[PDB]
Amino acid sequence: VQLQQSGAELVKPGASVKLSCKASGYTFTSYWMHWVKQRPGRGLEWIGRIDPNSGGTKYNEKFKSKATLTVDKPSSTAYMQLSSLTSEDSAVYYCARYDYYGSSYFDYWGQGTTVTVSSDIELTQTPLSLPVSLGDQASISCRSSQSIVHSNGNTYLEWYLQKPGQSPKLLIYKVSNRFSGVPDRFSGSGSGTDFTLKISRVEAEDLGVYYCFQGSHVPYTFGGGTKLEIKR
Amino acid sequence: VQLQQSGAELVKPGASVKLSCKASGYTFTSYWMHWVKQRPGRGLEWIGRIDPNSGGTKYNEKFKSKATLTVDKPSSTAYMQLSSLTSEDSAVYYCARYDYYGSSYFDYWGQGTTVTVSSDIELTQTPLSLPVSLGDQASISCRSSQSIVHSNGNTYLEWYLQKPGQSPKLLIYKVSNRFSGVPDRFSGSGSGTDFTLKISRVEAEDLGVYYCFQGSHVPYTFGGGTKLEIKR
Amino acid sequence: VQLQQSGAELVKPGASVKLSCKASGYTFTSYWMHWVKQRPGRGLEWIGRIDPNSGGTKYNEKFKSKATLTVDKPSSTAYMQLSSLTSEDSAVYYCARYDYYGSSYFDYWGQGTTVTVSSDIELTQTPLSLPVSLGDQASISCRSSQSIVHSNGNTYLEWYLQKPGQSPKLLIYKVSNRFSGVPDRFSGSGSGTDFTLKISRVEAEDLGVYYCFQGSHVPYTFGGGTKLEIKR
Amino acid sequence: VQLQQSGAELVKPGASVKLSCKASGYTFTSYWMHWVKQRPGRGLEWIGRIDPNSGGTKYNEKFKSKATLTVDKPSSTAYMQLSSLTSEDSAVYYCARYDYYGSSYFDYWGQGTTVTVSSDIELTQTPLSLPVSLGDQASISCRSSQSIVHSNGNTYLEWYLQKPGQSPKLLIYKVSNRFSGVPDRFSGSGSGTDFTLKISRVEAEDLGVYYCFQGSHVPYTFGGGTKLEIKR
Amino acid sequence: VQLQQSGAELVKPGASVKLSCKASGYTFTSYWMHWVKQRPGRGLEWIGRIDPNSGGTKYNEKFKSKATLTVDKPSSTAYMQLSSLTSEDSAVYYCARYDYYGSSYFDYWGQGTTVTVSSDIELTQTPLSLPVSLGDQASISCRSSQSIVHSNGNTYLEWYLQKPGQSPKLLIYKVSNRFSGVPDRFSGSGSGTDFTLKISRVEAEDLGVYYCFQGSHVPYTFGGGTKLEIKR
Amino acid sequence: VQLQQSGAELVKPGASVKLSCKASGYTFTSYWMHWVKQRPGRGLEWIGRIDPNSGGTKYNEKFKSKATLTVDKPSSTAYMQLSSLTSEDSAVYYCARYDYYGSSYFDYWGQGTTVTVSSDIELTQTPLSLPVSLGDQASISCRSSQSIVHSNGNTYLEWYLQKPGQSPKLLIYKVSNRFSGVPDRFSGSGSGTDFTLKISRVEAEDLGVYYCFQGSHVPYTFGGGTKLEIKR
Known part of the structure; x- marks a missing residue:
């Protein structure tokens, strides 16, 4: 014999x-x-x-x-x-x-x-490209390969917006909390492995690339990005 | 913060x-x-x-x-x-x-x-295969991904011919100069990123694989080769 | 030079x-x-x-x-x-x-x-899947990329059977020799680079994944496996 | 050259x-x-x-x-x-x-x-051996090659005692503060690069090897040790 | 705590x-x-x-x-x-x-x-130098830091002689056994951690450097050597 | 066996x-x-x-x-x-x-x-310290473990002076040749493995550390140095 x-x-x-x-x-x-x-x-x-x-x-x-x-x-x-x-x-x-x-x-x-x-946790973001008309509503998806809930009970899922030629800027933290100075047209929701970012009325300053991020389990990872652009 | x-x-x-x-x-x-x-x-x-x-x-x-x-x-x-x-x-x-x-x-x-x-500089050679009839004229192309001009003003672009089972032999150096002993049927031309090797009248001894080479910027690189063979 | x-x-x-x-x-x-x-x-x-x-x-x-x-x-x-x-x-x-x-x-x-x-020696096993009816005869193939004969004259080609959730078990060694306790319904044959395992009458206990193996030349390698399963 | x-x-x-x-x-x-x-x-x-x-x-x-x-x-x-x-x-x-x-x-x-x-900071501890009579007062020196003051204002100089067959135990922290359980007979003093540990009336339980330690600048280091034993 | x-x-x-x-x-x-x-x-x-x-x-x-x-x-x-x-x-x-x-x-x-x-096992060999008269008896000591007994029961303690300008040659193996060609004048004894080599009547051909060696525990090691020379 | x-x-x-x-x-x-x-x-x-x-x-x-x-x-x-x-x-x-x-x-x-x-070649420089009176003659030795002669015929033995608070400066090259600006009071001699530097009449500006150096065989090496100071 054994x-x-x-x-x-x-x-x-x-x-x-x-x-x-x-x-x-x-x-x-x-x-x-x-x-x-x-x-x-x-x-x-x-x-x-x-x-x-x-x-x-x-x-x-x-x-x-x-x-x-x-x-x-x-x-x-x-x-x-x-x-x-x-x-x-x-x-x-x-x-x-x-x-x-x-x-x-x-x-x-x-x-x-x-x-x-x-x-490693993989974050799938959809769609890759989202053409929109100013004034319209928009919604972006971010799903994870494993749960983003930390043992302490918090879910460190965040959303960032990168404008052409600039560095990313924070919009939402802990799934649904808006960063200081971010307009109320932006809202986040979801839990576990499925999340959503919504924009009530798209303004010109909102165009750029959106990224979701998870800081719950190492190594921390980012989604692939969604480009919100003018419809044409 | 800043x-x-x-x-x-x-x-x-x-x-x-x-x-x-x-x-x-x-x-x-x-x-x-x-x-x-x-x-x-x-x-x-x-x-x-x-x-x-x-x-x-x-x-x-x-x-x-x-x-x-x-x-x-x-x-x-x-x-x-x-x-x-x-x-x-x-x-x-x-x-x-x-x-x-x-x-x-x-x-x-x-x-x-x-x-x-x-x-690294990439050298694209065309065509991969060139069937010809003895006595005919032939032309081979070699294009680089970046300029082959050295800061000292010279362009170190060379052409080599490898016969079956033997090592390569030098034909042209510095774009258009013929090596000692090479027949005048061979001529080279071009500049910057586009080069050409021409053969006025193909002889039986000319069949084999031709390669272009650049010795201007490290790492020095070779083209993929062109096989000149009898038409049939 | 020279x-x-x-x-x-x-x-x-x-x-x-x-x-x-x-x-x-x-x-x-x-x-x-x-x-x-x-x-x-x-x-x-x-x-x-x-x-x-x-x-x-x-x-x-x-x-x-x-x-x-x-x-x-x-x-x-x-x-x-x-x-x-x-x-x-x-x-x-x-x-x-x-x-x-x-x-x-x-x-x-x-x-x-x-x-x-x-x-390295590569062992190609065919087929990948073999559906059979209990009572039927079966045959599996294993071919090598190079000779499996050792300089001492022996050919170390073996066959193993792995049942669901268990470790592999030896069936045949040295091409055609049955391990102690293995039923005579199993037989192996071949030489050089082509080998075969045959089953005269398939029983329920015979279902699982079969693997061929060579221990003649380092590194020792295994075939890809053949899954013998109930026909349906 | 210039x-x-x-x-x-x-x-x-x-x-x-x-x-x-x-x-x-x-x-x-x-x-x-x-x-x-x-x-x-x-x-x-x-x-x-x-x-x-x-x-x-x-x-x-x-x-x-x-x-x-x-x-x-x-x-x-x-x-x-x-x-x-x-x-x-x-x-x-x-x-x-x-x-x-x-x-x-x-x-x-x-x-x-x-x-x-x-x-690295070197802590010179004197003396290596210290024989004393029961009831006597004992004094130990610890001097450093560099200041033990940290940029935050604190001085992380500590004193430890390792009794025969046991692990070390903390006696003094932040130069002069007593840890829990530590007898009032133990006192620490000093500043910058010069420190001292004093034992007012030596008892049997006090015997062993004393070590000074600095936790202000990496890598953190210990003094060579002082063996307190009795003049029986 | 604990x-x-x-x-x-x-x-x-x-x-x-x-x-x-x-x-x-x-x-x-x-x-x-x-x-x-x-x-x-x-x-x-x-x-x-x-x-x-x-x-x-x-x-x-x-x-x-x-x-x-x-x-x-x-x-x-x-x-x-x-x-x-x-x-x-x-x-x-x-x-x-x-x-x-x-x-x-x-x-x-x-x-x-x-x-x-x-x-690692250290073999201390005494003396480093040993001047003798032709015909005299010679004795060499080899003591180890750990037992030379192997778990299989054998004691792989050996003695070698390196004549001037030649490679070493085996004299004694397994403590007291003579290799082929070795004169009866050479004898080995000992056990555990203490061994001795004796030469009954020194001859010119016996001159050189003697080494004890242990092949029982890895890494296998040699003694420092003993130079046998004559008191001319 | 052989x-x-x-x-x-x-x-x-x-x-x-x-x-x-x-x-x-x-x-x-x-x-x-x-x-x-x-x-x-x-x-x-x-x-x-x-x-x-x-x-x-x-x-x-x-x-x-x-x-x-x-x-x-x-x-x-x-x-x-x-x-x-x-x-x-x-x-x-x-x-x-x-x-x-x-x-x-x-x-x-x-x-x-x-x-x-x-x-590697070792340059032994003598003496380590050399106190002299202003106006006195000084002599420095540099001897090597291997010949400083190069296969091309030259002997790359050099002498350098490092004045207090300054970088070294070249005095003698190829055994006996003076560099630019160097006073005629400095002279070098020697061959093979033995060389000498002489200063005819010591002046204040001559004080400092002298070094011999060999650039004939890799790795190139320096002598230990000679500190010339006055017997004030």
Whole structure:
């Protein structure tokens, strides 16, 4: 035999993690140990191997800078240290025993350890272009891939307006609060993962590019932008 | 408040640059400072932030190896050091003040600093294939994405011919000069960004792949090649 | 002249290699030397240059971390050290003499040195999905991009079956040998680069994803998988 | 020539700096430029050089990872970028013009640019060993290489006691304030760079190693320690 | 409160370790957490700190490449990852809670976590010089800092002789076994950490430098050497 | 068995080298191969080993970043690549065959390959302090560890004077030539590795620190300095 692996891991990009594989039912030092990777619905890959008796190793060139293999004879345990994790590293990792002789590569497998690296929040803004007539009403959409609610209860969703050649300016903060000096024609609403910015009556000074932003979970991200322009 | 940023930067790939953001109209140490990136017509990205009072920082994992944030209390100035610049780094960079409390992320913005990383010169060669009959005339085109004139007044545009299985051989240098031993059937012309190689009467020994080259601005680059082959 | 280059190189990913270019028929220290790269049917690229007299160098930013140029005056030889080789590095490399003055960049070329970095073995498995009726016969294909025969004479081609939510289990090893406990309804055959797994009569417990694997040449690789599922 | 260098730089460890050297009185591109280092009363070292005409460079192997040389032709200015500065980098840096024919090395010198990397604060604690009789009064000294006063007005000088087999525990904070539980027999005094801890009547529980600590300027540092033991 | 740290770690050079610090008795997110290092009888050093609420961090420049700080809000636990450990990393590591208003630095301390990086085995060989008369008996000592016994039961202690101008050659293996060709005049004895080599009757061919060697625990090491020369 | 190693290597700092070890008299793949280092009169160190059959390797942690081991089965040759060489890398490197059953370590040795990394030139300047009376004659010595003669025939030995509060200024170039403005009272002489600077009649303006410098072999270096002061 049996190969027992450590529990599930949940980490953020850049983190490191050390997985273990304990062996029983045979002489640990008499068989080699391999490690295999399996991405969500993508396929299997060979990482490398170690001989527990002498400590010699051999790696897949692709994973040489990402993984390090070791063993602890007294406890009959094999380890794999992973560093600088990225989204491409989310997978189920297995340890497998190599035969006593040299024919079969993986005769006994551990149950596997799932390692999930968190995904950045994506903000989808629609539409990309919004032609309007002065005096008309307008509405812009901003939806997130995950909840924007912070553990402290606040939802840090904001809206900015960038005029041609200038830097962005704050309009709305915390979903529905207007910044000091912003006209009441602007209003924000929504919650969780769906938000909306509305303009009751469009003025000439309102034309430009609008952006939504979330400051609830790192890394903080911005929407793609919506260009409000004169209809013609 | 007011945030005044440093002037425009023009650099080549691999260079480093340090941007500054001076604050006035408030107590510098009482508010946090963030830095934002905006690529030409692509969108906004959050880089990271620093607390001027204690010096603590938090970065977007994506930019951790590219940027370093610091401050100088006496002059109330914030700095961002960028290293190993590439074409993907050309953008307008902004500094923005974080509220006294914690609601709004960017209530006051600097005017921004544009950082332009120079682009490599691309040589477009046409046609890719040119079938010809022995005895015929031939003409090949080579156009550059930027001027090939050097500050010293010379235009280092050259033409090479590579026969099957052999190394390239020089034909023309400095736009229109024939190398010692090259037949007068070969002539080159052009200037600035558009060049042409002509062959008055094609001989069997002329078949192979022709390449244009520019040695005026680093990195020196070659065109994609034109294969002159027997018509059939 | 004459520029004589060193012989062909055959290496695996991650390796390093040092190429040489010996000059004769002129005063070595009186002309600069450049190095050029040419990938299989892709085009020419400028790497960098060195002045043999003073030792000064100038590099294409793209190759600065990959190559280092040096010279040995007594033997009139120029060298280029390449490190951390990858498949993108397989090419023919040339050394070329820069004029005495500054007009023509490459008036005399060496014959070139071909550097080939070995390619990983790819296992193509077909079909991706195989719907079947219980009791029917089934056949799965696995073909390799290169021979799976090891120098010692064995062919380490194996087959694995992964049931929903479980780890893979060994079925066949060394092309046609059944693992202890595997029913005789499973049989494997083939050699060289083409292999087949057959099931005489499909049972309910046989449904899942089948994978072929090769442990003959590093890095060891797996096929893409075939999902055997109930016909409906 | 005349060679005008940029002003003094006061930086903390880890920072980078970019120095300039403006040339006048001759044709900038016709002469090579060298850079030299001089540490406080220690001697001279050659860093490297650049040819402004072609852009080629040559470095002292020791400084290859630390310095990068570039030039700007239009403004007749040479630059030297230094990165990841440490205490061993504090020095006066000079630029110097090479002879036209390379007959001599440093014909004309700039006035120099002083770069100072800040030194960490060192707390000298006296005495290392302090044997006392039960009931006696004890006195410990802590003197610093730099003022412990912070720009906000406070002086973060503290005193800790580590009893045998235990972790340290706080005794005095902000020079003279007692933490919770601390006996009135302990008192602290001092200002700027000189401080003292006094124990009015030594008891068995007072025995161990005392440490002074400063939390005013990064990196925060501790004194060497004082072992209080009895003259049994 | 209470700050509970993880158990002792015994690691070899090159490994990484992740330490935890569980907090109870107060609101985890309301106070900053610091980390401190204490080498065996050497003093205290400040590593860095993290604000559990916002996630900002500040490091001692010296430890920036060695340590990474993170927190897990739900479980009220702080973490410190140490990488590429060396002998200078062996120490007791502590976590400590900052004052609510930052008036003092380390108000409450964890019990500490001991991290021991294994030391290489040192073979002390005596004497450095050994003048003898032809025909005399010679004796050489080799004592180790750790037992040369391997878990498999064997003791890989060997003796080598390097004759002037030649490469070393094996004399004795597994403490007392003679290699091929070795004269019966050479004999080895000893066990555990103390060994001896004896030469019954010194001959001219015996002159040179003798070395003891241990191949039981990585890295394998040699003794300093003993030069056998005649008292002419 | 016989183990034939490649010839001597003379390299400059920063270079890389690849050593070979050809085996004969036994089946190459049936025995492990070890590599050992021996610095000039300093002792022996174990680098690492490789199993030619499976390709597994084990390194001494100290040399992991410096050495890489590989084998070529067809030619029965083992290789060791060393990179980024420094002065501490100069030594004789050996390959040695392991026992068939691992009973002993280095059973058969190659003849060794000497690798010499060139040392920088050291200029010893005497005396460090030189008190003189106004009007007296002064003499300064500068002797080198290697010849200052360049392959082109010239000897780039120079003398500089740094007046209090000023930058250095050139006095003598090419051993005995006076720079512009330099008084006739200054004269230089010498050749090869021994040089002298003489001042016929010391004046107040002559006071300061004198430095000899060599610009013949990289890295260019300065002498320690001589402070000329008056015996007031």
